[PDB]
Design a protein around this ligand. Structure first.
Ligand SMILES: COc1cc(/C=C/C(=O)O)cc(OC)c1O
Length: 283
């Protein structure tokens, strides 16, 4: 059903998508020990999850003051949107993981380290992704089917994941947060460009779908960064990821609130994981 648009516009999920779907994915609370101690996360498994199939995986970080339970809590209800989108065929089934940057020495900035060493091997050894194994080689070999996103301070987390984890992750969804490395937007853009250079990847091998609200305070810092990134050769601006790799969706009137940001995920997540995919699909 899904077809890429070149300038996709903001559209909230129908109100009905905010209520429970009968085809409900299972949400599993997990606990693991890593470099920041013993911590928890939730794993959303799609309805019909079959461990003998391979699923895309999207890791999604909360904002400041929140935790690994927030996104599937009653304050957000993202699972209802996922369930309905997957049942209706708008979104291909995938695993969605909500970890936390709380605990131990962890911060929104440094979470990528724990992500690489602890979170990916824990989750992807248990559940069926494109990783045939969870050695560094096995994670890197499956990077086209792995994404990371997050809201606010979790948007900051996303940018640090991008800069430090291009080897492991191809799709990025920073929501209402900018990258804090640099004294100007050009410094931020240049850091990202240098990470890309170091990775050796082509422009067909990483994708950034950023979003915020036109009344969201984070726009002030995101917008200059996006414009600086658009000037790099590293990014081809368009939401058609069969043709380019960079988009910034700005929702008219929306403020810095999960009530809006959940809809950005609804709009953007369907755009992920079709480039070099293993099914024969026409988008
Ligand atoms: C990472 O980028 C951001 C994070 C926050 C966080 C706010 C909070 O935790 O209260 C606010 C921003 O713009 C105003 C922003 O650009």
């Amino acid at each position: 059903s899904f077809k890429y648009e070149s300038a996709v516009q903001y559209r909230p999920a129908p109100d009905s998508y905010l209520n429970p779907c009968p085809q409900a994915g299972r949400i599993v609370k997990e606990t693991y020990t890593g470099i920041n101690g013993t911590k928890s996360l939730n794993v959303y498994l799609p309805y019909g999850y079959d461990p003998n199939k391979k699923y895309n995986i999207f890791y999604l970080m909360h904002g400041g003051g929140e935790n690994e339970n927030t996104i599937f809590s009653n304050d957000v209800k993202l699972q209802n949107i996922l369930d309905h989108a997957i049942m209706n065929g708008e979104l291909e089934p995938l695993i969605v993981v909500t970890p936390t940057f709380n605990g131990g020495n962890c911060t929104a900035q440094n979470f990528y380290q724990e992500f690489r060493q602890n979170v990916i091997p824990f989750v992807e050894s248990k559940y069926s992704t494109y990783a045939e194994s969870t050695t560094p080689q096995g994670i890197a070999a499956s990077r086209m089917h792995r994404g990371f996103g997050g809201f606010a301070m979790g948007g900051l987390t996303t940018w640090y994941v991008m800069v430090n984890c291009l080897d492991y992750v191809a799709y990025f969804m920073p929501l209402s947060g900018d990258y804090w490395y640099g004294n100007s937007p050009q410094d931020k853009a240049n850091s990202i460009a240098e990470a890309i250079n170091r990775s050796g990847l082509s422009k067909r091998e990483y994708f950034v779908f950023a979003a915020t609200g036109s009344e969201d305070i984070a726009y002030a810092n995101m917008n200059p960064q996006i414009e600086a990134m658009k000037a790099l050769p590293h990014f081809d601006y368009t939401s058609d990821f069969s043709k380019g790799n960079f988009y910034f969706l700005v929702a008219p009137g929306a403020t810095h609130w999960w009530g809006y940001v959940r809809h950005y995920i609804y709009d953007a997540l369907p755009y992920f994981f079709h480039e070099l995919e293993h099914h024969h699909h026409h988008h």
